Structures are given as C-alpha cells and as structure tokens.
Amino acid sequence: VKKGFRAAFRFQKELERQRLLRCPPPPVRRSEKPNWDYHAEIQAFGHRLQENFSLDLLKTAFVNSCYIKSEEAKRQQLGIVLLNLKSNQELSEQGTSFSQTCLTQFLEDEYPDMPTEGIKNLVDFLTGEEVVCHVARNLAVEQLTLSEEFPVPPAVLQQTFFAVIGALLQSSGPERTALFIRDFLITQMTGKELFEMWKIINPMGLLVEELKKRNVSAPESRLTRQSGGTTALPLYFVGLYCDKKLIAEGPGETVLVAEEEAARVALRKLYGFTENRRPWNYSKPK
Amino acid sequence: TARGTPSRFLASVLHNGLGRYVQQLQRLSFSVSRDGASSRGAREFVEREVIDFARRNPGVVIYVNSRPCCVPRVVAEYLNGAVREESIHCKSVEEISTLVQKLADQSGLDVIRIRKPFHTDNPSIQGQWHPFTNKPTTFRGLRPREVQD
Amino acid sequence: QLSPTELTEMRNDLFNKEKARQLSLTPRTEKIEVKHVGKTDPGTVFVMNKNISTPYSCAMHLSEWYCRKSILALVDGQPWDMYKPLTKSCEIKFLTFKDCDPGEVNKAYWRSCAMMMGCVIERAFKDEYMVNLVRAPEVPVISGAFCYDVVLDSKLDEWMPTKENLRSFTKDAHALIYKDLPFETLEVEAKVALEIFQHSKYKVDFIEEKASQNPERIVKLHRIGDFIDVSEGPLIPRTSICFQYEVSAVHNLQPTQPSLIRRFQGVSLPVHLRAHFTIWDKLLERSRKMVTED
Amino acid sequence: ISHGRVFRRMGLGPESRIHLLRNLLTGLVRHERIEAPWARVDEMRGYAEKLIDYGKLGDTNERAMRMADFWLTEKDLIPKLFQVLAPRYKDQTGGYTRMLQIPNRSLDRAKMAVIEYKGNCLPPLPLPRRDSHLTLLNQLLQGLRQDLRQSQEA
Amino acid sequence: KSGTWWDEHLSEENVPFIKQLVSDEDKAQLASKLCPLKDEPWPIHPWEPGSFRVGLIALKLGMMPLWTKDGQKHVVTLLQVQDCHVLKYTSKENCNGKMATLSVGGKTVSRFRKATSILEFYRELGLPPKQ
Amino acid sequence: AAPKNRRTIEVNRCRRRNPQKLIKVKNNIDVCPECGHLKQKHVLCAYCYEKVCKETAEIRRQIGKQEGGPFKAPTIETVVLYTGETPSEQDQGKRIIERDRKRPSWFTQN
Amino acid sequence: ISRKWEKKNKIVYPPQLPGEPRRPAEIYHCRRQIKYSKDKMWYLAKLIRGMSIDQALAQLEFNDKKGAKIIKEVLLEAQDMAVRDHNVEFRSNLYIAESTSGRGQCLKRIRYHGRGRFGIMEKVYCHYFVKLVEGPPPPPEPPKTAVAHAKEYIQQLRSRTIVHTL
Amino acid sequence: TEKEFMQHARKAGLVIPPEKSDRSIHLACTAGIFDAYVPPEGDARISSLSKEGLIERTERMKKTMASQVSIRRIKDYDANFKIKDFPEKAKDIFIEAHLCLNNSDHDRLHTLVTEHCFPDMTWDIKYKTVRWSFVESLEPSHVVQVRCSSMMNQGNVYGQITVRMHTRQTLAIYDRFGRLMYGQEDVPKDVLEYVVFEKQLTNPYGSWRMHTKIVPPWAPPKQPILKTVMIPGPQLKPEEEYEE
Ligand SMILES: [Mg+2]
Ligand SMILES: [Mg+2]
Ligand SMILES: [Zn+2]
C-alpha cells in the first residue's frame, strides 16, 4: 500500500470512463442535464440563426400535442392551476403549407423545364422526414423541443421544425422567411443527382413520353463503345440517337443497364438538372 | 500516428456558410471556485471578460457555476452534438481569453486527421475522365481486325 | 371458375379456420397424464397439454434421439401421427423403421410418398391442362412401388411421359424434400371436409366413402405447405424423412374409353433405411412394372 | 518391413507370448467366456479353434494328449476338453468360438473384447442382430425376389 | 449424417440373394461382350509404319523357370489377363496431345465399394467396374 | 538443441488448433434397441454387456459353492436353473445350477 | 479468485411485453478445480461447442479422455438445473452456446533430476465453463460459394475511387 | 515446493448451539398450529349462502367453550382489543404482505408475516417476478377460531386467530427471463382460503402476523401451469429388472 491520494483519485476517474464504455447509460434530454435554462436557450436560438423571433410565438413552436397530454396525466396522479399552453399544430400547418409553396416557387423558377411531378418530388424530398430531421438535429431544435418520448421521433421532430418557420413567418414576414428556407433546405441538394432524390422506374418509358410532347421522334439506341463483351467485367456505352443525332450517352456493365443509364442522362439534359448546371445563387437579393 | 488514429474527410455542419454563417458553438459552461488559487485566472476572466464576450456571441449561452473545485473547467457544446471539455486550471487571463475564442470558431467536428485539404461535391465540370474520352471512333465501330458481312 | 393459383388460397383459409376453431374449443389449459410404455425409459409419465401437446413434444422431453427415429407413435394400440395433438391421457409408444414388426410404419411411410407425389403432379403440368387427382391406392409395400391415380386433360389422351419428363418429377420431389415441410394432420367432420373439395368430384366420392366407414364421420385432412389432400391413416412427420425418391414410370389403367385414369408409380426409401446405388437400380426396374391392388 | 507376418509381438518375447496365450486359453476353457484386450483375444482365437481339433482326436491319441497337456496349465481341464467341449462340436467343422468387441476398459482405455465357446450355459451375449425381414428395405427386396423367381419359373 | 454400407439393413435372407443377384448380373454383362465384331465394330485399318496400338492390363501371378533349346535357363513372369476391356475413347483433338488416348480397365471389382460417379459410368457402358 | 527464440501464441494457435489436433466427431453412435442406451455399431452395448456380467458372476459364484475347491472341474455339461423350473428332458446327467431368482427375460432357456 | 459465472445465473430480466418475442433461456454452470490440464480440456470443450445437449453427451460418452467423463457430468447437472430452476420446458431442446476451459489454482512440487538438479513440477488444475441456450442449435454457416466470392469481388471493384486527387 | 491447498474445513452440525451456554435462541413464532382446524366439508357452497354463513360463524364460537375462554387470555395482556375489528384489520395485513412480494420489500414483510411463513413466500420467488393485486372483495372476513398456547410453555404465551377470507385475486408470475410462467394478469378469479395469524402475547412489542394458510382436503385443484412437465421413471441398473 503506497501512500498518496492523487494517483488513487486519478485511477478512479479512468475506471469510471471504462464503466461508461462497457455499460453506457440511456440517453437523456439536455433539459434534465445540469446547466440548462429554457428561457435562455431559446433567446440564443433566434440570435444564432440571425432572426427576430417572437418569444411568445417561438415558445409555442416547440410544444407538442403529446407533451401536453402526458403532462396533464402527471397532475392526475398527484391530484393537482390549469394550463393554457398551445401546441404547435396551428404553426406547423402554416409553416408546412408556406414551405411547400416557397420551395415550389424556387424550384420552378430555377428549372423551368422540370415537370410538375419532378418538382413535387423534390419538395417532398427537401421537406421529407429524413432531410428535415437531419437539419433539425444540427440546429438545436430537438434540444428545445418539448416531447413526451426521448429521443424525439422523426415524425414529431419534422412537425416541430415547421412550427419554427410558422413562428418566423408571422414575426418576420414571407420575404425574410423565404431566405430561411433557401439557406437550410435548398442547400440539401448540392451534392445530389436528380434521380437520387426523385426515384423513378423505367426512365426509358418516361423519356419516350417527353419527346412526344416536344414533337421529337423516338430515339434509337446504338452501341457507341464496347469493351470486354465476352468477360464478366464488360463496359457498354449505348447512345440515344434522335434523327441520327446523339442526345445522350450512358455507360453500364451490360447493354440493358447502359441503355437505362443513357435514358437517365437524356432526361437530366432535358430537365436542365445536369451536373454542369450553374450553382444556386445564394447571394443577397438586389 | 495516422495509422494509429481515426480520420475523416473535410466537411461542415449543414453546409454552413453556403447561404449564411451560423456559429456552431452553442453553450459554454464555466465552473470556477470562490476559494482556490487554481481559478484565480478564471475568476479574473469572469470579472471583466466573460461579460464582453457574451456581447460578441449572442447565439451562445454561457453558464458560470460557482462551486468548490480543484481544476476549473470550461465545457463547450456544439450544434452537431459534440461536447468538448477543457481545463483552465492555472491559466492567465490572456490564455483563457484566447482559448475561449478558439472554441467559438471551431465547427464542433472531431479534431482528427483530415484526409484531404479540399472537398467538393462537383469535382468535374467537363466530365470525369473515362478510357474512351480520348479514343477516336471508327467507321461502323468495328473492332481491330474484325470482318463485317 | 376459380383459377388454380387461387384455388389453393381458399382451401388453406378453410383449413386454418377449422384448425383455429379446434384450438378455441380446447380450454385455456388442460393436463393429460401421458404414460410411457416401452422397453426404453420405463415408468416415465408426461404431464402434457390437451389438444396442444403432440407425441413429438413428448419425445423432446426424453431425448433428441426419439425426435429423429420415432417415425410413428402408437397410442393405446392405435397409430398416431407425431404432430397430431393428443386428446386425452393415455399410454404412448413410439415406433421406428428398424423394429421387429414395422408393418404399421411402412404403411404410413408408403402412403406419405403417394401424397408427396400428388403434390408435384398439380405443379408439373401447364395451367392450361386440367389435372384432377383421384386417390392413392393402398398398395402393399411388397408390391415394390407406390402409385397415385391421376386423370389428365382430354388433350393428353395419348401423351406418354418420357425419360426426361420423369426426371423432372424427381427434381420437383427433391425440392419438396429439401424444404423439410412437416405433415400437418387435421381430423374434421365430413360436412366441413366436403366444403373444401367441392370443385373436385373425384375427391367428394372418396370423402363420402370414409364417412360411411366411420360412425362419427370424421375425415382426416393432411397438408404439405399449401398443398392439401385427403389421406387415410397416419403419415410420417416431415418430408425430410425420405432420402431416395424417384418416379419409375406412368401406366394407363383400363378401361380407357369411358374415362382415362393414369397410374403414376415410383419408389422411395428414407434416410434410416438408405440403400446402395447398385441395390437402388434394382428397385427402380421393379417399380417401373405396373402393379395392381389385390 | 513386415509383409506376411501373421503372429503378433507380445509379452517379453516369443516364449512369453506363448505363456500369455496359454493363460488366456486355459482361462477360456475353465469359464467358457473371458474378457481380454482385443489384440490378445484375436491372437489367442486361432489357438482356441485348433485346441478343439486336437480334442476331437480323442484322449487315446498320444499326440493330442501332449497338446492338451501343454496348452492347459490346470490339469483338471484336460478331461473337460475331451469329454465336454469336443463332443459338443462333434457335428461342427469350424467356428467354435465367437469374438465380440466390448467398451474399452476405464483403466487404460484399451480395446477390449470377449471370446466365448459356443453352446455354453452362460447368459447369452447381446449379439448384433441384422434388421428384421419385415423392414421397408427388406420388403422391397423380398418383392423383387418373388418376381424374379416367378419369371424364372415361367 | 451417418455413413452406411450395402449390407447394413439387409436381413439374413436378403444377403445371400443380393450377393447372388449382382453375381449373376456380372456374369451376364461380361458374357454380353463376347461378340465384338458382330455388335457393329469400328473400322479395322491395316497396319502402318509408325503405328501404336493399345495394350492390356494383366495381373502378376508369379514366376516360373523356362529353358531354351540351347540349354540356357530363363525365369519368366506369368501375367494373366482377366476382365480386360476397352472403357472409352478420346480423340486426338480432345486429347490435347500428339497421340490419341484409349482407356482400358482390368479386373472386376465389387459395385458396392465404388463411387456413384464410377458406378454410373460403368452402367451406361454395360460392364462391371474395373480395379 | 535449444530453441533460438520463443514461439509466439499466434504460431502456437495454428499448431494447437489445427484440424488434425482437433477431436474428430464420431458418426457411428446409435441407440440400443433393447434398453435405449447409447452404443456404437461395432461394439456391444455397455448397459447390456454389464447386465450379462452381473448375472454371469452370480452363476459363477454358485459354481464355486458346488465344486468346493480348485481342480474340481466337472466332466459333464452345466445347466443353470432358476426358481420355478425343473430339469428338462435334454437336461439329464448334467450339473444343475440353482439360482434363487426369476429367470431374466433376455436369458432364454435352451 | 473470480466466481462471476455463478452470478450470471442470478440476473433476472424484466417481464416481457405480449408482443415481444420469446427470450431463449440461458443457463450458466461451471465446475471449479478440476484436476486436469486446461490445454487438454480445451479440445473436449471445442468438440461440443455449438452442439445440441444430446449430441454433446453422445460424443463425450465414447471419448476416451478423462475430461470427457467430467464434462458429461457437468452437462447432466446443467440440463437438470435448467428444467428444475430455469423454467425450461424440454431438456433436450438445449444446445451448447459457450463451452471453454480456464486455468485454476495450481500447486507446486519439486521434480528431482540427475546430478543433484531439480525442476519445479506443478499439479495443474482447470475450470470448465458451459452455457446452455434453449432452442435448436443454429445451422452452421454455409461455405462461401463462387457467387458469394464473385459478388464481393465486384463490389470491391465498384467501391474504389480516384485517390490522391479532388 | 511444499505449499499445499488450504482444504481443511470440515462438516459440522447446525441444529444446536454449543452446550452449557446461558444464552439460548429466542423464538418469535411457533413452528405449527397448536390445534389443527378442519373446516366443514362443502363450506364453498356456504360462501354463496351468505345468510346461513353469518349464523354459523356466530353460533360456532359460542358453542365452542374452549375457543371462547382463549379470547379472555388475549384481553388479559391487551384490554383494548375487539374481535369485531380484527377481521377488518386482517385484510390490510394480508393485502400489504402480498404487495411486498412484487417490490421484494422483505424488510417490511417480516413485520407482517412470521418467521415460519417467510420461507414459504419468498424462497420460490427468489429469481422470479410476481405481479399480484387485490381486485375486489366478495364476503367480509369472519373470525372462525381463536386458540391460544399453554401458559408458560417456554416463558412465552402465543395466541392464534383463524380468519376465513373469500376474495378475488389476480396473480401473474414471470420466470427469470421475464417469460409468462403461471396465471393471467388480466382475469381475476375467486380465492377461498383460511388465513391463520399469530402473536407473541408475552412480548410487549409483539403484533399479529400472518402465520400459515389452511388448505382443506376438499379444496379444488389449483390452476394448471402453462408449460408441460415430465416425470421420469426409476433409473435401472443393469442387474436390476423393471417391475410394472
Ligand atoms: Mg503386417
Ligand atoms: Mg543424489
Ligand atoms: Zn443396450
């Protein structure tokens, strides 16, 4: 037994770290953890995003219907004044309707050749359950959200996120809130292809319909490049020819896959969603 | 070490700075001691510097909990969820002021080796090179020493 | 008229509804003191559940060895299927292929192969041809083959299977063996049984025959996966029991002018009684010869 | 190189090999069933079969008496050989003893076997029995045999 | 999951029959090849210089002295040829060699102790397996 | 000759856990038809062999009480008798061995 | 010393929800201070690893090693314990999940050599640990086939990028 | 090389403490009931006939002289005691004692049950989860029999009161892994049991605790368990032969 407290104390802390790794504790809300003030954390929320939020409106944006129902049940167990808290259902409807129309406005102006179904999918993707939740969890939205179950379900988190837009829409107006959608939702399709967000089936069948609307004859698929046909690792470049004019060329391991990819390349050029398209203009409006 | 440590590619939080810049720092927790020489520098930072620092960073909530402790610490929480804990045990006012300022500028991502000093979502504009980029086409696309009809 | 792809859908629904009804009739939990009577482990008493526990479940209590070799269960001197739930407390006794007098075991296995062969007949032919099963003649084991009466479409009046077509049935039968599908037996009233097989008049006559013999007029229903057929007596527990399986040949019964009835023949052997390739070829040749019940 | 060697190398030498088998042979005659290591039982089995052959020559044969005198250490068993074992196998011409393997002994996990003279009064051993003629495989072969014989007749 | 042999499940009455059954079949199959020039033989070309014909598969019986008319003594080896048949023919093109390969088998062996692939090979040839 | 270097555990595992060193699974185990205990195909049942030796020892103990000393081997056949039995027609002029116990079922009187 | 394996049987799980699947029964049993080498014991524990409870007993019954009798006695008392105390419906349903050997407390003796030399002989002891899980043994992993090899190889060729560039 | 294992502990007896000792073990509860009580056959039918049951309980106490004087002994050590409050007090003790089993509150259960009753309750539920509840009460409890111990058997006097309870109860027992093992947590069923209590009258700090339960020979069979069981026959050595 060697005299000394500092070494023994330091070893206990190391053991505690190992205990956490072996048996991690269940996750808890940031509110329950020490150094938390709901009034202070929500004031900084507006300043962090550089917006003139309304405290009364924003405090109602994080309140969920499930939270109110569970909170009332807590008082019944103790028999305990009435709460006038308002849920975010009213604000979420305002934000969701405005966001879809604002995204539709932005996408239709940027891509005039994109069909309405194509624009609908992109708005359904940017406002989708995964994109909204990914943006919400990195803006301290889940921390301020008053939910009944932790972690916040993705459906609950998506609805709370649009309530922040609804609170922002009333306080700052539509022009100011339009930049909020562009700076957080439009930037979510930067490194993404057209059909990676708008998943389609049989692009060749969709390509034939598009050329009928433009009075263009059906393309003829021909082999432009070929390599390793008899091997298990071939390379086929099939090209679509309209009136003996190449409109797109697609690669693939086999001929059917290459032709399907060639159709996807043709659709991207028609809709103007190619990789070569000019980037979204994030500069301040003039 | 690079082989003995993890690594990541250069990236940002929600494409920060593309349309607007959002300060990734979210919260600072200072635990100073009323009595104790270790927190003498931290106490002087709270007396004159933390007040003016809050003005320059309105989006960051600062907590100053005065409780007995031997090693004063600063806890920094970022939007992406990473928590960074640093000790200001026996540090002068200038050292703490510079240390706190560095925590404000960081994005919260792990401070590990970055594989590339650059990152782009559209590396090519004229088309990524493929073996047929610089190969001419032949009449009827015939293969070398292939007879047709 | 219902399509062949959907005809089996409704048969299982009636089978499932009737099988689930019998569970509902059984109380929440009823105990039956099953007593083991055998040369192995004398005096063992199994406290099982009524209409839920099966002789296979009793085997799992003793050892895994019973679960593999107990092809058939003998309850109170009467054969009992391994997966057939027990109705009352009674003495129990298991049977294997290798016994002093495996007469009952061979019959159960022999009928099982006939039922398995019937399953692949309904799938081999095209959906345009009308193939309706008739019955499985209860031929003796010493006859050398098991047969299943089948009547085909009028178009195939003179079509005779070839060597390649017969090999196709074997691959279909082996695919059934690899699935290891259990034999599920269900004793139902003839009135309920007639409802399932209304379309097939060749089976209605067979069901009515069983109703006359049995005073309670209960008809046994056996199914392999989705295929459902009417058979007499207990069967083997699973399709994996048979190791070597091969259809020998197809012969046409007489008279043919009033109706054409074909006899699909074959020979099979289980894993417990595997035979050598040289010996197996001898059994194939005999099975190709037409056999008629006494 | 050991090609054609039929006799095993046991005991402390060629003489000790005979004495080890002689003790087993003498113990086999007295009890008509003994347990011993499998190799020693198999090596002694040949001498057990030929001992009865000398026993059938009769006690009046001088040569047969000398073989019985040597191979039976206990002299009370010599009258038994010429009056019990030899008359028992009078109709038989071979196969006087049956050799069966038994579980290895716990002492040294040695391969053990039991050798007995047929017709003894001791409780029967659980002899290995082939599958009954009523089995599924036998019935298929029984039916095949009937058809081949019937077709042969006609 | 356990291996088996040909007479594991056979009863006391079937073992003599099974042995006799296959024994009769082997006699018939060997006696069905006694007319090679009558069962559509291949064309018989005359001998040419530089030609190579097939050999046999003999069984070494033993040795026996043999004297000549000059008084010298020679010892010879008795090679008995039994159940020697042509198994299969491989053309020069498929041989991947200058010559053409011809398969020959010697000495009948039990069908119960052979592989399934070998047994089915001899089944279509109509000959008992060769060692 | 002494080792030049210490062999590592990684080298040792490849030698110790090699499939040759591992115990081979036996596939010749089957249940005894008589008692149900486990046995091998080429070996007599251990349970069934033990019951024969237990009965054989009792029979051989009865022989010792009749001979009453060594070098007294009988020159006639021997017959083992149990309670409730009488000497047979062929069991005449033989040494009857009485056993005060019921005849075992597996022991068939011949 | 450590006796955690005994304590692994005393953990009680919360009652399962009606929609939750059936939880397999886990039985932890061990025998301490077996006068046997742990290295020799490992071969017997490796043999019955992954086997059924009845299949494991059959292999141990005809095995000539001394530990085979010792392990078989442990399995019999573990099979009895599962039905008697761990609420297991079928004793044969169990299969071997974990079976390993461990070093035990060993003695030290002196082994005399020639020329007045000596060596230190140890009387080795071992522990045997077995875990039983209710339910049929999991099927062995099928050997990797050509299609599995081909699919993986092409995936490697598809995941490669242009390195040391943009 | 002479070191050896410390295997030296030997078996000993736990029945009796060392002899010639002034200290002796103090017992708070008696092993068994002083006089066995046999409820009349068919008392389950009397449960439905509440009007007849009320008459019988009062008459039996008056017609039993021995049980009537035992109540006098109880009030000799505790004047403020009534037999019209004890059956209502017994219900709270009974329910509270079975509510500690779900939470494994063995610290307080010892104050509600005796040292003899404790092993019967907790030993079989050591590694099992019990969900027991009291749904409703059908018939009020009645003090059937009161019998006390002999005066100064070992320096202490014990008194036992028999109480009959007929109430609906819900029992849900889960095994070590949380799987359902016995009973249904939804449907309650009626239970008719005779609870016997005890108290050490000589001890000033004593109190009435549950002692045991009377199980009549005419009691209906209990609820069958969900799983199946096997009862193996006698193990037979090779020399032994089975007898039927
Ligand atoms: Mg040799
Ligand atoms: Mg010396
Ligand atoms: Zn046996």
UniProtKB/Swiss-Prot annotation, chain A:
Major site of localization recorded for this protein: mitochondrion
TM ranges: none
Gene3D superfamilies membership: 3.30.160.20, Ribonuclease III domain (1.10.1520.10)
Cross-referenced SUPFAM superfamilies: dsRNA-binding domain-like, RNase III domain-like
Domain named DRBM: residues: 202-272
EC number: 3.1.26.-
Function: Component of the 39S subunit of mitochondrial ribosome. May have a function in the assembly/stability of nascent mitochondrial polypeptides exiting the ribosome.
Subunit structure: Component of the mitochondrial large ribosomal subunit (mt-LSU). Mature mammalian 55S mitochondrial ribosomes consist of a small (28S) and a large (39S) subunit. The 28S small subunit contains a 12S ribosomal RNA (12S mt-rRNA) and 30 different proteins. The 39S large subunit contains a 16S rRNA (16S mt-rRNA), a copy of mitochondrial valine transfer RNA (mt-tRNA(Val)), which plays an integral structural role, and 52 different proteins.
Protein name: Large ribosomal subunit protein mL44
Organism lineage string: Eukaryota, Metazoa, Chordata, Craniata, Vertebrata
From Swiss-Prot, chain B:
Tissue spec: High relative levels in skeletal muscle and testis. Lower levels of expression in the heart, brain, placenta, lung, liver, kidney, pancreas, spleen, thymus, prostate, ovary, small intestine, colon and leukocytes. Expression is coregulated with TWNK.
Organism: Homo sapiens (Human)
UniProt lineage: Eukaryota, Metazoa, Chordata, Craniata, Vertebrata
Residues passing through the membrane, by range: none
Record's keyword annotation contains DNA damage: no
Cell compartment(s), UniProt: Mitochondrion
Keyword Transit peptide: yes
Entry protein name: Large ribosomal subunit protein mL43
GO terms for MF: RNA binding; structural constituent of ribosome
Disulfide-bond pairs as recorded: none
Alphabetical keyword list: Mitochondrion, Ribonucleoprotein, Ribosomal protein, Transit peptide
Protein encoded by which gene: MRPL43
Curated annotation (Swiss-Prot), chain C:
One GO location term (cellular component): mitochondrion
Location of the TGS domain: 30-96
Tissue distribution: Isoform 1 is ubiquitously expressed. Isoform 2 is heart-specific.
Main location as per UniProt: mitochondrion
Subcellular location(s) of the protein: Mitochondrion
Keyword Acetylation listed: yes
Keyword set, alphabetical order: Acetylation, Leigh syndrome, Mitochondrion, Primary mitochondrial disease, Ribonucleoprotein, Ribosomal protein
Swiss-Prot/TrEMBL GO biological process terms: mitochondrial translation
Top-level taxon of origin: Eukaryota
GO MF annotation terms: nucleotide binding; RNA binding
This protein's record includes keyword Ribonucleoprotein: yes
Modified residues (N6-acetyllysine): K93
Transmembrane segments: none
Signal sequence range: none
Complex and partners: Component of the mitochondrial large ribosomal subunit (mt-LSU). Mature mammalian 55S mitochondrial ribosomes consist of a small (28S) and a large (39S) subunit. The 28S small subunit contains a 12S ribosomal RNA (12S mt-rRNA) and 30 different proteins. The 39S large subunit contains a 16S rRNA (16S mt-rRNA), a copy of mitochondrial valine transfer RNA (mt-tRNA(Val)), which plays an integral structural role, and 52 different proteins.
Protein family: Belongs to the mitochondrion-specific ribosomal protein mL39 family.
UniProt disease link: Combined oxidative phosphorylation deficiency 59: An autosomal recessive mitochondrial disease presenting with multisystem manifestations of variable severity. The disease spectrum ranges from lethal infantile Leigh syndrome to a milder disorder characterized by hypertrophic cardiomyopathy, lactic acidosis, attention deficit-hyperactivity disorder, and survival into adulthood.
Protein name per its UniProtKB record: Large ribosomal subunit protein mL39
Organism per entry: Homo sapiens
Gene, per the UniProt record: MRPL39
UniProtKB/Swiss-Prot annotation, chain H:
GO CC annotations, alphabetized: mitochondrial inner membrane; mitochondrial large ribosomal subunit; mitochondrion
Signal peptide: none
UniProt keywords, alphabetically: Mitochondrion, Ribonucleoprotein, Ribosomal protein, Transit peptide
TM annotation in the entry: none
Localization: Mitochondrion
UniProt GO MF annotations: RNA binding; structural constituent of ribosome
Location (main, coarse): mitochondrion
One GO term of the biological process aspect: mitochondrial translation
Role noted for this protein: Component of the mitochondrial large ribosomal subunit (mt-LSU). Within the mitochondrial ribosomes, required to direct the nascent polypeptide toward the tunnel exit and position the exit at a distance from the membrane surface.
Similarity comment: family membership: Belongs to the mitochondrion-specific ribosomal protein mL45 family.
Quaternary structure and partners: Component of the mitochondrial large ribosomal subunit (mt-LSU). Mature mammalian 55S mitochondrial ribosomes consist of a small (28S) and a large (39S) subunit. The 28S small subunit contains a 12S ribosomal RNA (12S mt-rRNA) and 30 different proteins. The 39S large subunit contains a 16S rRNA (16S mt-rRNA), a copy of mitochondrial valine transfer RNA (mt-tRNA(Val)), which plays an integral structural role, and 52 different proteins.
Official protein name in the record: Large ribosomal subunit protein mL45
Classification lineage: Eukaryota, Metazoa, Chordata, Craniata, Vertebrata
Shown chain mapped onto the complete sequence: 52 to 295 of 306
